[PDB]
Structures are given as structure tokens and as C-alpha cells.
Amino acid sequence: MDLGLKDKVALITGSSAGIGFTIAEKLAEEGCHLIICGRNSQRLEQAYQSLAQAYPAQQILRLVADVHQAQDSEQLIQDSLNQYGKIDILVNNSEAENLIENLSDEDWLNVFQGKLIGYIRLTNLVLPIMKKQHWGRIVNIIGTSGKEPSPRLVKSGVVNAALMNFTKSVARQTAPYNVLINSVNPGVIDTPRHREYLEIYAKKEGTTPDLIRERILKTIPMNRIGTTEEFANLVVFLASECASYITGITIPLDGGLSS
Amino acid sequence: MDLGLKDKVALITGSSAGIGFTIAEKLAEEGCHLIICGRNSQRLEQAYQSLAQAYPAQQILRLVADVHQAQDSEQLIQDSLNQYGKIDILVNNSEAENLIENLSDEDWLNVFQGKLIGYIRLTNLVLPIMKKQHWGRIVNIIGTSGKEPSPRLVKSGVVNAALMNFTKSVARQTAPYNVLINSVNPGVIDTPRHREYLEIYAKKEGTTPDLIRERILKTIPMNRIGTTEEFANLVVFLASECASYITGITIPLDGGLSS
Amino acid sequence: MDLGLKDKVALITGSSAGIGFTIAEKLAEEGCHLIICGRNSQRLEQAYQSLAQAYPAQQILRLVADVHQAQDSEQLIQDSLNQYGKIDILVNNSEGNLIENLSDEDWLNVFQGKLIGYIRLTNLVLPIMKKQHWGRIVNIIGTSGKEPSPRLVKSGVVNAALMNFTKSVARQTAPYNVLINSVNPGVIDTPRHREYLEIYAKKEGTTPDLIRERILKTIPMNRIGTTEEFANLVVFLASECASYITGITIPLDGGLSSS
Amino acid sequence: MDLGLKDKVALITGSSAGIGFTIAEKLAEEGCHLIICGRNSQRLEQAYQSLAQAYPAQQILRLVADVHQAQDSEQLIQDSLNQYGKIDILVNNSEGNLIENLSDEDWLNVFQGKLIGYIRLTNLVLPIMKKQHWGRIVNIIGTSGKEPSPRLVKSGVVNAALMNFTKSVARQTAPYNVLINSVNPGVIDTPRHREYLEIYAKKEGTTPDLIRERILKTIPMNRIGTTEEFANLVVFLASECASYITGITIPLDGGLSSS
């Protein structure tokens, strides 16, 4: 399937590893030029070298930035536009206490100043550019940062509900400009954070990582943990010319967890 | 129907007028003692005098407080507990630019520091008290402050989605203590704010209030605007002993708007 | 709370036992005259005698009828009208797997039971209620005493259909003050539930106690609901007080929907 | 993007025209062999000749069949298996008011059409796909060219049922890599849509142009979708790339679901 992505410019946040990295790879495979970013300069350079070697014909800009910080986010967009003159695609992809009574005002304000305002801010920054182009795709990754999907995750639940509604509202307003915005909700995907979570959960309980993994597998109807490639495939489809009539929706990519 | 509310202590925020006032009246009718509050001392005194005269056998504490301010909210709960020794019921009931591109970081942070954190904070403050009692009811009024319900209302959409999810999470955690929490989503209810909105909309467009009202009536399947009594009836039911198996849900009270 | 039900005429199907019986009791307590029905004459007579002795001031009509059969359902309504001249309230409460096993005849038989049963009875009472400018229909949308689970395929399909039917009919009948809502029970202690525990335990090779323990850990309130708790909401929805509530489905489930 | 569809065998119902025809075309483009069907031999032959001439390297089996009839549906699958030995993909795409007017026979006839039609065909292909450890079923859940609206009561009930069926079957078949999803079209430019515009305009006493203008103002993208745009998503869901997506319903609607 021709996705119509040749020479499209894609900014993928959180692209030094895991889901974001594989999304960047797949976008490059379809002919996009890339902006990849993250806070960890060492990890980002490894990603950058891997992508440049795998896709020597494609342009790749790497930028160290904290996309939960206003100044870094503003400069990220300015540097991207300076390099490429356009930004066609934005993939928003960014990152303990679970008991309600224990969460203070500062705790909640702190959660809102992370991913929630982070995605809103970056969306706001790219919208004028995409509207000028009459072409944009924004895909919001609305998950739990490698934790087992569960209603117990209270902070992420609130933030993710807010972001799903924001997605609908912005989609409705930007649809007349062919700027489309959708969200994808991962199930259990085999990422570095997921693997780190297996280690952390195995200790709190007194067991092994393989044992915790087996318990997780029982909850997934497919009885298999998803790959980053499986997740990336949908994101790339949504970011394509082929998804030109799809906007304002949230899609679970989860091996049946939602059933 | 005996609602089992005799001598229960109910705190109703935003109770100087409109929905909150009628909820306070109906709770007093069922035998509750009240805490009523609001920022407007003059309006609150009028409410206080009306309730005291209508329900002379019931205790009524009135407190001037801004329930979007942390200190006022903390003191509200402390003063309530000092007066009554218990708080059985909390009704969370508190209050322009609509285009996404025009909304800054400060704008969004400001919206989150209002009703969103306001309801979360007050919930957090009453939970230890209600859990000690093994008896609590929290009803969150999740609406649009007298504006015509519409997907266009972007700020309230995000906040309300967040609050509906928060409701579910807190309900799940507090259910083992018989502390039940639910939300009610008003449709078009005849309140002071609604009537003020008719005036403001009639000017922006060049028409009358009755004309704007007629346009609103066409959107409501019942072809009638709801009364504050109709709204209050459900809130009082949810706050009662009779609703002892109902928690974590959101109920539209809207004359069919959701259909 | 005065529910405004004095002398209202209520038809409750499946009212010989369990949820339906308790709903009938509670409606009589609030001043309704009743029509009760069931397929088994002996069980229906027991219910009638209990209700007639408890509420001798109220009129109670008992009729043997299979409300999944067209002729019986039509005659039930005609007999009710001949007795009372009106029907104010209908509570639809009638009874109700490996996908590859389920044949066409199995699915068609499913649809010719509760699904068309509720639709047909709704159709039969609508003109009565519309001419009154007063009606309440409450659809009980449950699993008929089986513990809620994604595994119950037929009931899931039927119940999804009925929830949508509820919305559609509500929208059409709203201006006639004929209000239609559904209640989705969680786990409620009925004779049917108790029999299901026996059957499931026998099939699983375990004890009813162990099945009950498994169910309880899924419910945030950590207890099974009573028929009185369930009936309270149904009676509220059938009342004058619920005059602005229509087209909605309310889970009554101890928090199961937030688990 | 390589969709991994080379030599896969796809059955598309309702494939003589419109959405079904375009889906068949696009599946052939990605390397599938086809089974196409319809009730009208002349229209089916036209579709066959078009596809056979466009994709002469692919196998195309055309069969006259009424997929709302049990015998025809059973024979369709047997004939398909006799030709190809396997069926990898099924796209369920078959055709499909005042409440008080609608009789039992009307509702039963509704349920004996598309509802049991999709369920039956799913049941027929499941064992084929399960033994392969590879299957994709995509249910087209629309209004068959009528403009989406709460007024369409029968389709709403059937479609709600089918969306739930999708979830239930997905959960059961997931470990066999047999994935089942639904797509809900908004307004798509098909011959059926165009005929509906004519009929609705005639019934309303207005022009097709004015009906189209009314529809366009409901769609945030301010345009009606093409069959190619719709087919793109169906083909993606039918692909190897969608290997972790199951049990979900995706609106393909230009933002209508966020309007």
C-alpha cells in the first residue's frame, strides 16, 4: 500500500528507544524525513546512528529536548522548522503512588505539568504550521509508559481521559484544514520500560520476571505481548495520506485487552 | 420513599443560588443538617435566611469560601467538622475563549487550577472523615456552568472528562468503606447562569433572549428546559441510604440531550 | 421524598420472585396499583397473596402470561387496560458461550425472547402513555442471575441492542413525558443468582462458597447487592421525581463498572 | 507499506458496487485472490469483468448468493473452499423510523437480515481461519448509504448488537490469530448514498444539493468521504500489519463522531 509519505517531515517525540524509535524507523521506511528527540543524549545518538545507517537516503535531525518543558518544546519546533521548512507529522509520545488519599495538590499539578500539558503545548505549536500547509497528522500515544494496563493506574487514567477528549476537540476544529488528529492506546507492548517494569514487579512480591510475564499473558486474549513494530504499523497508517478521512478517534492496539 | 437522611450532615458547594441552592433545600427537606458556602457573602446570606425560615428544625452553617482556593477549602472542611463532628455528604458544584490555537500553557494551567483540582482537593479532604464514619456520599456536578451543552466547549470538555475518570478511580478505592461517589451531568437547566447566558448570546448575534431559548428548546428531545428541582431530586437520591449499591457512575440529567 | 406515585398503575413483568417481586413491593409501598405476571400460576399466586396481604389498600391484578409470546403479551396489556383504564409504568424484567457452537436457530431463538419481548411490550404501552402525557418505562438489562462477564455472548448482544433501543425510543417519546431508561444490575442476591452459584459450582467442580468468594473480589464494595437496593433505583426512575431523566442506562453494581 | 497480503484469499460480500467493490479492488491490488458475490447476476458480472481485466494475475471467483439466506451463505463458503482450500479474510458488507409503527414482523425481519447474516458468515469462516492460525474479519457497520442520524432506529439496534458481537468473538478467537474488528462509515460517496439523496430530497420536497449541503455542515472535514478512503482502512485491518488489533470498532467519518 502506497502511504503517500515520500518527503513528508515527521517529528517523533520519545524516539530514542521503544515505541518511538520503531515509529521513526517505519516512517523513514515509507520515505519520511525525520526529527527525533529525547532527553538522553547518549541513547538518542545510538538511535540516530542506527536510523542514519538503515536509511542513508533519508534526512534525520536529532535534537536533545525535554518535551515536558515549555522552552525546550518551543525551541524543538523552531529548530525543526528552520531545518525543513515544514512539519507534516507529529507523534506525541512521552512519559508511582497509586492511592487517592496520598495524592496532594502539588502531586496532581505536577502530573498535569507533564504529559498532559506537554501534548497540548506541542499540538498548539505545530497547528499553525500544519494549517498553513493544509496538511498535518498528529498521533497521540495515550498509554501507561510500560506499566501493565489497569484501572488501578489513577494518575494516568485522569490524564489519558483528558487527552482523549482534547483529541476530539482539536480534531473537530482543525478538520477543515486537513490537519487530522487521532490517538492510539497501547496494550502490553514489549518495550524497555515494560521489561524494566517486569523486573520491578518481580521484586515487590518475591518472584521472577518470567513469572510476572506469565501472569500478564493470561490477561491478554491473544496470549501474546505486542511488538513495537505491530504498534508502529498503526501509527504510520494514521500518519499517512491513506488515513485522509480518519480524525478525532482513539484506537486501542492491545491484543484484545479492551474486549 | 424514606431516604434515610435524618441528621446526616451535607456540605453543598455553590449553594447560594441555582442548582446548589435547590440541592441544599431538598437535603434539608429530607432531614439533613447543612453546610452551605460560596464567595458572595450577600447572596449566601439570602440563601441562608431562606433555608433557615423554610426549615427551622434543621441546623444550617453558612461559610464564605472560595472552593477553588486551597486555604479556603481546607478551612471549610475544618470549620464544618468543628461544628458537626461529621461530614456525611459532599456535593461538588463549582464553576470564555473556545478556539484551541488561542489557548496558552497559562490558560490551560489556569483551567486545571479551578474546578478540576477544586473537586479533587475537596474530595481528598473529606475522604478520611467519611472513611472513619464508614459512611459517605460524594456527588460531583460535572456540567458547563449554565452554557448550552456543546462539544464546542473545549475547556470544560477536557476538565469534565478528567473528572468523570477521577470519579471512577476514587469510587473503586473507597467502595470498601461505604463511601460512594458518583457524578451527574446536567443538560439545560433553568438557573441564574443559564438566564445570564441567554442575555449574552442574544446580544452576540442581534436577537432576543426568547429567540435564543427557542433555538435551545429545539435541541432537547423533551422540548423543555429542566428545573433545578428536577436536577436536585437525582442528587438527593444519590446522596441517600437508598443508593447504597450505586458508585462510580456518571448520570446525564438532560431531557434526552444524550440521545 | 415524595415520589408522586399515589394511584399510578404499574406493570412489572417477571414479578413472581427476585428483582421483579421486590420492585412490585416497593411500587405498592409508594402507592401504586399493580399488574404482576409470570408463566407459572402457582408461583404467581404465592407472589399475589404476599403482596395483597402486605398492601390490602392497593389494587393488584395478577395475570398468567408468557411475555416472550406475542399473543400473551397483547392480551396482558388489553386485560390491564380493561381493569385500570391506564398503564403509567412498565418495568421490563424477563429472563435473560462458545461462538462456534451457536447456530442460527440459537441466535434467532435468543432474539425472539427478551429482545423482541421488551420491544413488543414497549410498543404496546407507548400509545397508552403518550395519550396520558405521562409514562415511565424501565428496562432491566442484566444476565438473569449469572455473574457478569465478557464470556456471556448472547446476553451481551441482546443487552447492547436493548441499550440502543432505549436511547432511540427515549428520543422519540420525550415530548410526551414518556420517559425510558435502563438499569444494568451487577451481582444481586436473588433466588436465580443462588441457583446459578449451585450450577456453576457443580460444572466447575468446586463449591458455591468458592464461586461467591471469587465474585466478591471483583466487586469494589466487596459485597453482593440486595433486591431492595436494586428496586430503589427502579422506583426512583419510575417516579415523578425523575421527570428530566430519559434515554440513559444506569449500572447498579457496587462499583463493578469501575473495577 | 508491505501489508503481507500476497496470495491471501479474501471474501468480500456486497462487492458488486460501492464500498464492497472498492474494497475488493484494493485487496486485489495488494495481491489477494478474491471471492466476490451479490444477489444480482448482471451487476455481479459487471464487477467481475472490471476486476478480472484490472487484475488478470489474480484469481477472482464470483458467486451469485443472497448472504441474508442460510442456504446461500453456507453454499458460498463451501464453493469458496472448494476453489481455494482456504479463506483468510472475510469482509462482512451487506445491506442495512417511527417506533410505534414498527411491528414484531418488522423487527424479526430486521434481525433475520444483516444481524444474523454477519453472525452466520462469521460462524462459517471461524473454523477455517482457526485451523490456519490466521484470519481477519472486518464488519462494515453502517447505515447502507443513509446519512447517519439518531432517527435510524432499526439500524442503530442492529449495529449496537454487531459491535458487541465483534468484541465477544474477538476475545474468543484472539489466541488463534483470527482478528475481528468493525468499521463504522460516516458519509461516503457511493451509488447507494447518491440514491438516498434523491429519495430523501423527493420525500422532503427539496433538492439533493440542499440535502448534501445540510450533511456537509455536520461533517468537520466539510466533505463526503470516498470509497477509496474507506477501503484503505479495511485493507489495513485485513493485513498482516494489523496483527495486534482486535475487538475494536473504528469510525471512518471525517470527524462526525467528534462533531
Structure overview:
The structure is a homotetramer of 259-residue chains. The first copy, chain A, is of the alpha/beta class and 259 residues long. Chain A has one domain: NAD(P)-binding Rossmann-like Domain (Rossmann fold). The first copy, chain A, has helices spanning 18-29, 41-54, 70-84, 105-133, 154-174, 192-203, 209-219, 228-238; strands at 9-12, 33-38, 60-64, 89-92, 136-141, 179-186, 250-253. Chain A has a seven-stranded parallel sheet, sandwiched between helices. In chain A, strand 5 (136-141), helix 5 (154-174) and strand 6 (179-186) form a beta-alpha-beta unit. The longest helix of chain A is centred in the middle third of the chain and has 29 residues, at 105-133. At the A-D interface, helix 5, helix 8 and strand 7 of A face helix 5, helix 8 and strand 7 of D.
CATH superfamily of chain A: NAD(P)-binding Rossmann-like Domain
Give the total of domains of chain A: 1
Radius of gyration of chain A: 18 Å
Shape of chain A: globular
Largest Cβ-defined interface:
A-D, 43 and 41 residues
Based on the structure given, which CATH architecture of chain A is correct?
3-Layer(aba) Sandwich
Give the C-level CATH assignment of chain A.
Alpha Beta
Can you write the helix and strand succession of chain A as a string?
A: EHEHEHEHEHEHHHE
Oligomerization state: homotetramer
CATH topology of chain A: Rossmann fold
The profile of the biggest β sheet of chain A is: 7 strands, parallel
Number-wise, the strands of chain A total 7
Helical content band of chain A: 40-55%
> Biggest sheet of chain A, strands in spatial order?
3-2-1-4-5-6-7
- The fraction of residues assigned to DSSP E strands of chain A is 5-15%
Number of helices of chain A: 8
**End-to-end gap of chain A:** 29 Å
What is the SS-derived class of chain A?
Answer: alpha/beta
